[PDB]
Symmetry: C2
Subunit: 207 residues, 2 copies
């Protein structure tokens, strides 16, 4: 994996992590914690415009077994792991223990680790900056929304409420007669107009 793997010098420690009050379980516990705090800092800093809800989803996606297993094979943990076979949520639990080792081997410092993770996650975060920080696209929503609730009698209008490209404020309201089915903000009036329809379709009711 393109960032260099931070090293465990102490043999007795490395072996706590790859031998297989009883055995190492405190490193799984410390690693988990360090890994979830570190990842929290990194995303919070990189995505200032994301809600707490999106941050919570981003974090669960990068601390979970799929991605931690992916890291573990790109560092060949299946090979370091002195075992016997392959679900099997294990490799993520090794990886948590491992981070738990780097952390103790440094006196519980963690800046040296935050930096490695800040690189280890770069491709995953640029993936999210493109497709997840943002909302969606849907150049179609106004007619899609019209085909649920629109005739010639009463069809939905999209009335701008705050206007002007001055320092940025374009917000439009999608109203069907008297009720504001959805409101959204975008740098332009049509982008906001479509997004106002997109928010409305998130709530399909009339059967």
């Amino acid at each position: 994996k393109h960032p260099p793997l931070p090293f465990i010098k102490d043999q007795t420690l490395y072996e706590r992590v790859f031998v297989h009050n009883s055995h190492n379980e405190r490193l799984e516990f410390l690693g988990d914690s360090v890994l979830n705090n570190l990842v929290t800092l990194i995303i919070y800093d990189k995505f200032p415009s994301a809600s707490e809800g999106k941050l919570t989803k981003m974090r669960s996606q990068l601390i979970d077994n799929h991605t931690l297993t992916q890291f573990s094979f790109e560092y060949g943990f299946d090979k370091r792991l002195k075992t016997t076979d392959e679900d099997q949520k294990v490799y993520a639990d090794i990886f948590e223990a491992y981070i738990g080792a780097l952390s103790v081997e440094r006196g519980l410092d963690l800046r040296e680790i935050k930096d490695w993770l800040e690189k280890l996650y770069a491709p995953k975060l640029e993936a999210f900056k493109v497709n997840f920080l943002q909302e969606s696209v849907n150049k179609e929503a106004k007619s899609e929304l019209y085909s649920i609730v629109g005739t010639a009698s009463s069809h939905p209008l999209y009335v701008v409420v705050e206007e002007g490209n001055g320092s940025h404020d374009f917000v439009v309201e999608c109203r069907m007669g008297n009720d504001v089915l959805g409101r959204a903000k975008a740098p332009s009036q049509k982008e906001a107009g479509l997004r106002a329809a997109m928010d409305a379709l998130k709530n399909r009711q009339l059967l």
Copy 2:
């Protein structure tokens, strides 16, 4: 950017994936499983059946499923909150809805899916799926067993100026700790230390 979310015209079929969904995730799962197979088959024409099984397995697991479900705001079309098997399964029901509404002609979701997977498929074709790279190995191996007074030596045991390729052993004492072959003498030497490091028995 990722492609937008195809539309579901039929209200009640929309509700059969979001307000409740059985039998659409059945159809959704096999559909999705196969279109991803076709896709990766075209884009990795040398990948053996073992790599293809792994590639399909990652592209279809709940993790990436659930994040397609999160990037299209499935959390918000859904009316218990929170991996997540469940969001993965609403996503399968969705692909199934898409299919029914178009009479099980799947060619036009393959195109969507190809757009939708275009990022991750480049990542796999980069040169690795689950592979290591060269390292900083000579020095970290040195840190375990090495003094200036006695330390390991990376001796060339065959040479490869274009014709064949280098193999170098990592010798210390009487014992060779690790050997490797790689296009370079550096790359072989580093990998030969990585091999010795994957086995820190003692010595």
